[PDB]
Amino acid sequence: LGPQMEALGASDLLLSEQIRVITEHRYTPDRLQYKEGMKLADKIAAQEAALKEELKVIYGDNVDVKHFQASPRTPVQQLFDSLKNAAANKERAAKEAAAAASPYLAYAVTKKQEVQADPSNIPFDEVLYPQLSEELLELELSDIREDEIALEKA
Amino acid sequence: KKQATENLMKLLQAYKDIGDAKSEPLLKNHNPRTFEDRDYPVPDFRTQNLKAGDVPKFFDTVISTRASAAIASKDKFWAGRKTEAEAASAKASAAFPRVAVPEWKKGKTVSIENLNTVTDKYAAALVPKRKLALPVLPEGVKKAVEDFAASVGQAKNASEVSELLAKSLAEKAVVTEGGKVVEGFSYVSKAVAAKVIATRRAEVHERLLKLWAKRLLVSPELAIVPLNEFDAQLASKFEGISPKYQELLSAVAQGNK
Amino acid sequence: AKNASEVSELLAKSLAEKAVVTEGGKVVEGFSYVSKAVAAKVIATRRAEVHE
Amino acid sequence: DRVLSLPAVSKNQVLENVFHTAPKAPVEHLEKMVSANSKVYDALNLQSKRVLIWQVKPALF
C-alpha cells in the first residue's frame, strides 16, 4: 500500500500532494487514470491558492493552508478572528485613507473597509446557496461511495 | 453591444426561470457522471484477444469511449436545453436596472456628494442578499456586564464571562434575508461538511485496509508484485500471462523454508 | 428574541457556578468548600462500592 | 475487470465542468469602478490637484 497507509485527508501533506503520490502508486505514468489524477492534483492546487489568498489578510503569508484545509474554520471562529484584528484593520484603513491621493479615494477606502469590517457582511455560500453547498458535499461523498461499492462487491 | 448584453442577461434570467420551473438540482446537469450509464453491457476482455501490454490499453480505450459518450450526452442535453432557453428568451421582455454612474451634465460639473452616493450603491451590492446575524458584543453591554461581575467580586474572571456570553450567542446565530429573519432556514457549515468527509473517508479507507489484510494473511506473496504493475501482466488467455512473476509467485507461495 | 429569555438563564447559571465567597464584605482569597450535594454524591458512590 | 465497474468520468473531468471558469471576486467590481471614478473626480472637481477647468475654460481677464 505504501502511501495509502493513511486516509486521503489524514496526512501531513497537502491534499494536492497526497493525490500525486497515490496516483503514482496506483497507476503507471502511461495509464489514462494517471494523467487524470495529475490534472486533478493541479486543480486542487489552484483551489488551494485561492483558499490561501482569501485568508492571507488575517494570518499573513504563512496561513498554513494544510491546517485550514483539514479543518475549516467555524463561522463562530471566523467571527472572533474578525474581531481580533478589527482594531489593527481600522487603524490600517485610517493610514490608507491618509495615503489616498484625493478625498474621494479616502472616502472609498473607508466605505470599502466599513463593509468588510461588519462580520455579518462576510459572504457565506452555505447561506446564500444552501442547496449548492450540500451538493458540493455529496459530490465528495459520491466519489467515496464509488470506491465503497468496489470494496463491497469484492 | 448593449443589445447583445441585454440579450445575454435576458438569457441568464431565462435559464434561471426554466431551471426553477423544473426545480431540478443545480449540479445535476453540470456533473457529467449523471449522464453515464453504469448498466452498460461491459464487454468482457476475456473474449477479445489481448497480450500482456494490450489489456491496460484496451481498458483505457473502453473508458475513453464511455467518458466521451457521457460528455457528448451532456452536450446533447445542453444543446436541447440551450435551444429551449433561446426561444424562451426571444419571446420575453427585459426590464433590468441601469448601471449606477455619477450624474453628469454637459454644462454642469459633478460634485463629490453625487460621487459618494453612487459609491454607496456599489457598497450596497457587496452586502449579500442573505446573511448571518452574527452578534457583535457592544462596548456598552460588554462593560455593563463586567461592572456587575466586579460588583459581586467576580472581577477576577469578568472578562472570561464575556467570552462565554459571546460564544453562546453566536452558537445560536440566526439567518436574515433582506434584514428580516428567515424562518425555518437550515444550513450546514463548511466545518461540518469537512468533518463528515473526513469520517466518511476514514470509513472506506479502513475498509480498504481490512480488505487487503484478508488477502495478505492468507496469501502474503501478493506483496511482491506492485499494484500499478498488476495490469501489465493480464492477457485474454491464462497461458498468455507474462511469466515475469509466474515462477516467482509459485516459489514464494511455498513459504520461508 | 425567540430565545433571549433562555440566554439570560445560561448567563445566571454560568455566573453562579463560579460564585465567590466573601467574609466581612471582602472576598476571601483561597477559600475552598465542598457542597452538601457533592458530599452526598461521594457517600452514595462510596456506599455502592462497599455494597456491591 | 473491476476497473470497468468504476465510473469512467474522472474527478478532474467533473471539476472542469463544475468549475469551468474561475469566478471573479465580488469586490473587484467595486475596485474597478472606483479606480475609473477616481479619474472622473480628477477631471471635474475644483479642489483636485489636476483639474481640466483651466484647460477647457482658459481665463476671464
Give the three cell numbers for residue A93. Answer: 484603513
Name the DSSP class of B7.
H
Name the DSSP class of C27.
E
Verify whether the Cβ–Cβ distance B119 to D37 is below 8 Å.
yes
Q: Which of A16, A12, A65, A8 is nearest to A40 (CA)?
A: A16
Name the DSSP class of C23.
E
The Cα A107–Cα A96 span in angstroms is 11
Q: Which of D32, C36, B172, B189 is nearest to A74 (CA)?
A: B189
| Inter-residue contact B231 to B55 (CB < 8 Å) | yes
Give the three cell numbers for residue A48. Answer: 488551494
Distance of CA B141 to the CA centre of its chain: 41
Chain A residues close to D14, C-beta within 8 Å: 139
Burial of B5 (0-12, 13-18, 19+ CB in 10 A): exposed
Chains touching chain B through at least 3 C-beta pairs below 8 angstroms are A, C, D
Chain D: nearest CA to B20, how far in angstroms? 19
Query: Residues in chain B whose beta carbon is closer than 8 A to a beta carbon of chain D?
Result: 27, 30-33, 36, 38, 42, 44-45, 59, 62-64, 66-67, 70-71, 74, 102, 104, 109-112, 115, 118-119, 122-123, 125-126, 231
Q: Which of B33, B48, B101 is the mutation pick for testing D, counting most D CBs within 10 A?
A: B33
The Cα A42–Cα A36 span in angstroms is 10
The Cα B96–Cα B6 span in angstroms is 8
Q: Which of A37, A5, A35, A43 is nearest to A20 (CA)?
A: A37
Q: How many CA atoms lie within 13 A of A75 on its CB side?
A: 28
Chain C: nearest CA to B165, how far in angstroms? 7
Which residue has cell 484477444?
A: B49
Asked if D27 has any chain A CB less than 8 Å from its own CB, the reply is yes
- The method recorded for this entry reads cryo-EM
| Inter-residue contact B131 to A127 (CB < 8 Å) | yes
B131: left (phi over 0), alpha (psi -120 to 50) or beta: beta
β-strands B180-181, C22-23 pairing: unpaired
Verify whether the Cβ–Cβ distance B122 to D17 is below 8 Å.
no
Chain A residues close to B36, C-beta within 8 Å: none
Chain A residues close to B128, C-beta within 8 Å: 121, 123-124, 127-128
B170's enclosing H/E stretch is helix B158-171
Residue A36 neighbours by CB under 8 Å, 6+ apart: D10, D11, D12, D13
> Distances in Å between the alpha carbon of C18 and those of B148, B157, B245?
14, 9, 72
| Inter-residue contact B149 to B158 (CB < 8 Å) | yes
Structure resolution in Å? 5.6
| Inter-residue contact D20 to B75 (CB < 8 Å) | no
Question: What three-state secondary structure class fits B132?
Answer: strand
CB crowding D5-34: b at 16 or more within 10 Å, else e:
eebbbbbbbbbebeeeeeeeeebeebeebb
Name the DSSP class of B97.
P
Q: Supply the angle between the helices B2-22 and B54-90 in degrees, to the nearest 10.
A: 110
Name the DSSP class of A120.
G
Which amino acid belongs to residue C37?
Answer: A
Residue B133 neighbours by CB under 8 Å, 6+ apart: A120, B173, B174, B175, B176, B181
Task: Give the angle subtended at the CA of B237 by the CAs of B232 and B238, to the nearest 5°.
Answer: 80
Chain B: nearest CA to D48, how far in angstroms? 11
Phi, psi of B37 (to 5 degrees): -90, 105
Q: How many CA atoms lie within 13 A of A99 on its CB side?
A: 6
Task: Give the angle subtended at the CA of D9 by the CAs of A50 and A128, to the nearest 5°.
Answer: 40
Residue C23 neighbours by CB under 8 Å, 6+ apart: none
Question: What is the maximum span of chain D, computed from C-alpha positions, in angstroms?
Answer: 95
Question: What three-state secondary structure class fits B175?
Answer: strand
Chains touching chain C through at least 3 C-beta pairs below 8 angstroms are B
The Cα B201–Cα A9 span in angstroms is 7
> Distances in Å between the alpha carbon of B14 and those of A104, B6, B74, C38?
39, 12, 20, 68
The Cα B151–Cα B148 span in angstroms is 5
Q: Which of B159, B133, B132, B131 is nearest to B145 (CA)?
A: B159
Name the DSSP class of A5.
G
Which residue has cell 464571562?
A: B161
Phi, psi of B181 (to 5 degrees): -65, 130
Q: Which of A49, A2, A44, A8 is nearest to A26 (CA)?
A: A2
Instruction: Give long-range contacts, CB 8 A cutoff, 24+ apart: A75-83.
Output: A75/A124, A75/B132, A75/B134, A75/B170, A75/B173, A75/B189, A76/B167, A76/B170, A76/B171, A76/B173, A78/A119, A78/A122, A79/A119, A79/B134, A79/B136, A79/B170, A80/B166, A82/A58, A82/A117, A82/A119, A82/A122, A83/A119, A83/B136
Chains touching chain A through at least 3 C-beta pairs below 8 angstroms are B, D
